[PDB]
Structure formats: structure tokens, C-alpha cells
Amino acid sequence: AVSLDRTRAVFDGSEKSMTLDISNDNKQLPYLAQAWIENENQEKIITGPVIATPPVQRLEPGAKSMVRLSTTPDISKLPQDRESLFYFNLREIPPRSEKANVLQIALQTKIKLFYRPAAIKTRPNEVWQDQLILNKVSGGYRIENPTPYYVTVIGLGGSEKQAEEGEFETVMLSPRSEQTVKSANYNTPYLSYINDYGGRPVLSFICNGSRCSVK
Amino acid sequence: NVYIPPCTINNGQNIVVDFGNINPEHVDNSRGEVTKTISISCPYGSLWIKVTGNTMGGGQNNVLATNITHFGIALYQGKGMSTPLTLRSTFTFTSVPFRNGSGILNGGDFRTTASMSMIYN
Numbered sequence: 001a002v003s004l005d006r007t008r009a010v011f012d013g014s015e016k017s018m019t020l021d022i023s024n025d026n027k028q029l030p031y032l033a034q035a036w037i038e039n040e041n042q043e044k045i046i047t048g049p050v051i052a053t054p055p056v057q058r059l060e061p062g063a064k065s066m067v068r069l070s071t072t073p074d075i076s077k078l079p080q081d082r083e084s085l086f087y088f089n090l091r092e093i094p095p096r097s098e099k100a101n102v103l104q105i106a107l108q109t110k111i112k113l114f115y116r117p118a119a120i121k122t123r124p125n126e127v128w129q130d131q132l133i134l135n136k137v138s139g140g141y142r143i144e145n146p147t148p149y150y151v152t153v154i155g156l157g158g159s160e161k162q163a164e165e166g167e168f169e170t171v172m173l174s175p176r177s178e179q180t181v182k183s184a185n186y187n188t189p190y191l192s193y194i195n196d197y198g199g200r201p202v203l204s205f206i207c208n209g210s211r212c213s214v215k
Numbered sequence: 216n217v218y219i220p221p222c223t224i225n226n227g228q229n230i231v232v233d234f235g236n237i238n239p240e241h242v243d244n245s246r247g248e249v250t251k252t253i254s255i256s257c258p259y260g261s262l263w264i265k266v267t268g269n270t271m272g273g274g275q276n277n278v279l280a281t282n283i284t285h286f287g288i289a290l291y292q293g294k295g296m297s298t299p300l301t302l303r304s305t306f307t308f309t310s311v312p313f314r315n316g317s318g319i320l321n322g323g324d325f326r327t328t329a330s331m332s333m334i335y336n
Contacts, residue, residue, distance in 0.1 A: 001227045006218035007335045025227030091330060094229050100324035103232035103279070103288050103310050105253075108332040109221055152336055154261055170261050170336045194336065198219025200259055 001025055001107045002033045002059060002092040007198045008111050009069065009088055011050065013080070014118035016071055022090060023064035030060045032093035035067045037113070040085040048072030050086050050115065056093075069113070080117040082148040082175035088113040112150070112172075120148045127201075129193050132173075134205055134212040140183035141212075145173035154200060155192030156183050163190035163202050221335055222257035222303065230331075232288075232310045239286050239320045243313035250294045252307045260304055261336035266290065267302055268329035271315060276301050278313055281327040285316035288327055302329075 005021040012018065024031050035052045038044050053068050069088065078084045091108035122128070129151055133144040145151045152172040155163040171181055189205040189212050205212040224230075234247045241247070255262070271280040271287045277299040278287045290300040291309040300308055314320065 001224050001229075003223065003227070004221055005216060007221050025223065026229060027227070029229060089332075091332075097229075097231050097326070099231075099233055100326055101234045101237060102326055103234075103249075104326065104328045105230035105232070106328055106330045107224055107230070108330050110332050110334045111221070112335070154336065172336070194261070197217055198258075 002031050002090060004088075004090055004109050004111065006111065008194065008196070009113045010196050011069060011071070011113060011115045012118075012121060013075075013116055014121055017068055018070075019066040019068050020088070021064060021066050022059070024059035024061055027061050029095045030058060030063075031095070033057055033059055033065075033067075034089075034091045034093060036089050037069075038087040038089060038110075042087055042110075049075040049078060050113065052088065075115070078115060078117070080119040082117070082120065083150050084115040085150060085174075086113040086115060087111065112152075114150060116149070122149075127195075129195070129201070130203060130214040132191065132203070132214065134189055134191070134207075136185065136207075136210040136212070137180060140181050141189070142178055142180045143171075143173060144178040146176055148175045150174055152194045153181070153191060154194055155190075155202075156181065157190050158184070158186035158188065160190050160202050160204075163192040164200060219258050221333065222255050222262065224255060224333065225253040226256075234310075234312065237312070239283060239312070239314065239322065239325060241312050241314065243289070243311065245296065246312050248296050248309050248311040250307060250309045252294075252305055255304045255306060257303045263334040263336075264306060265332045265334060266300060266308075266329055267332070268327070270302055273315055275313075275315075278302075278315075279327050279329055281325040283320055283322035283325045285318075286312070286314050286320055286322070286325060289313040290329075
């Protein structure tokens with residue numbers, strides 16, 4: 001199977017292109033790798049504002065290559081004070097099985113592609129997720145994301161272990177938004193999220209009544 | 216590398232559900248229900264799986280068309296023809312031949328393809 005090098009891609013709006021590494025992990029057969037972009041509703045767009053090339057390429061067993069993500073002039077039309085959401089897709093076209101009477105599975109990877117305008121370009125060590133605010137309500141918390149970035153929440157517990165381990169319905173807050181999640185009550189809430197690199201940091205909150213903020 | 220990579224699917228091997236040598240003339244209600252289990256090895260689950268592909272006409276929502284008219288492959292979640300499959304850890308799915316018509320079928324051999332998307336959070 002053909003695999004990508006990451007679980008999310010961040011397109012730095014200050015640049016006009018970027019590349020993602022792919023590789024054919026199969027040690028026997030060569031694969032075709034289809035790549036395309038989808039908008040925030042997971043609908044395929046072939047005209048921009050973000051393009052993927054090549055649309056298809058051949059990968060020898062164990063070989064690695066890349067896909068180039070680039071923008072069009074219409075990229076300027078997206079708002080510049082917040083991230084926009086796209087999805088990058090890579091589907092493998094396996095070799096025709098010699099054996100007939102078979103069901104062949106074509107694997108595909110779909111990851112979020114965050115367009116991040118130059119006006120909100122982040123520093124290398126910048127952490128904006130510590131700006132999240134938790135408001136206790138019946139059955140859980142109303143999470144507020146006042147930042148210009150999408151934030152994916154993967155955990156929420158009364159300890160560091162629960163946050164990262166505990167069962168949780170992952171949700172992604174769009175820029176400057178809020179949404180309620182189900183959860184037990186915690187004295188010192190801990191929240192886990194997926195950052196730009198795929199790391200899963202844990203945050204610690206301190207509460208002042210029903211409103212909790214990062215320590 | 217700096218970027219945490221996505222999970223590897225059944226050790227980068229090819230996934231093929233083989234039905235062996237069978238005549239497309241079956242009961243499609245309990246036949247070559249071939250079950251498949253593919254492994255998911257991740258770096259850190261936060262992943263969704265959607266299956267899509269060409270479907271036959273009719274009201275069924277879990278049947279893939281094949282290269283044989285009136286003949287398709289029905290899909291079910293987990294081992295067993297119980298719960299249908301609308302079109303570290305493991306994922307099991309059951310595939311069973313299905314013919315939506317009586318009469319002659321143009322083809323002794325059949326093959327079809329479905330896409331299995333790993334959608335990351």
C-alpha cells in the first residue's frame with residue numbers, strides 16, 4: 001500500500017507550493033497513486049484554489065516520491081484572517097490480480113489540508129490551543145475556540161491519562177467557533193489535541209466556577 | 216520523521232478477497248460469505264473508514280456491481296452476514312456473492328473493485 005508522510009497538511013499561505021512525501025510500502029508489486037483535492041464538504045475540486053500534481057504516478061515496490069500541492073491566483077479570494085479547510089486524497093490503484101472471482105480493495109488515505117493565510121502565519125514554537133476555554137454545562141462542556149485556526153480535540157479527562165487515553169468522540173472546532181461535547185465533570189480538566197505535526201499534546205485547565213482556562 | 220505518519224494497513228500488502236472457483240449461480244443469501252480481517256498499525260485511534268464503488272441498480276445499499284450483469288458482491292461489517300456495510304487494531308468485513316436476477320449470466324469469471332478510505336482526524 002502507498003502511504004503518506006503525515007496525517008494533516010498545513011499549507012503556509014506565504015508560499016505558492018509545498019510537497020508531501022509518499023512511498024510504496026509493498027515489497028512485491030508496483031502501484032499507481034491517484035492524488036486529488038476536495039473542499040470542506042469533501043467534494044472533489046479540480047480547478048483550484050489548491051491543486052495536486054501529479055494526478056497519477058507509478059510507484060515501484062519500496063519506491064518513494066512526492067505530490068506537489070500548489071495554489072492558483074483565486075487563492076487570494078479565501079479569507080485571510082482564518083484558516084480554510086480542504087482535504088488531500090491519495091488512492092492506490094493495485095495491480096490486476098491474476099486470480100479471477102475476486103474483490104480487490106483499493107486503499108485510500110484522506111487527511112485534512114489546512115490553508116493558513118500569511119496574515120496568520122504561526123511561529124515554529126507557537127501554541128494557540130492553550131487559548132481554548134471550557135464552560136461546564138449539563139452533560140459536559142461547551143468548548144470555545146476563539147483562535148483563527150481549526151482545532152481537533154481528541155481527548156478530555158480528569159487527568160493526563162484520561163485525556164490521552166479515555167474514550168472520546170473526536171471533534172474539530174472551526175476558527176472562532178464553539179461546540180458542546182459530552183463528558184463527566186472534572187476538578188482539573190485535561191484536554192488533548194492533534195497539532196500541526198500529528199503530535200498529541202495534553203493541556204491542563206484550572207477552573208474559576210464553570211469557566212476553565214489553561215493553567 | 217517530524218511528522219507523525221498515518222497507520223500502516225495490513226503490512227503494506229495487497230488486499231484481495233478471493234471467492235475461489237465458484238459458479239456465479241448461487242443462493243446469495245448464504246454462500247461464499249468470505250470474511251476478511253485487515254490489520255491497522257498506528258504510530259500513536261482517530262480514524263474513519265468509508266467504502267465506496269460501483270453499485271448495481273435496485274434498493275440495496277451494500278452491494279457492489281461486478282463485471283457480470285445482475286451479479287454483485289454484498290458487504291457486511293464484521294464476521295457474519297448480520298449487520299450490513301453501507302457503501303494496534305483490526306477491521307473485519309464479510310463479502311458474499313449476490314445475484315439480483317434469475318436467468319442466464321453472461322460470465323463464468325468475475326472481478327470488482329471497491330475503495331477503502333482511511334479518513335484521519
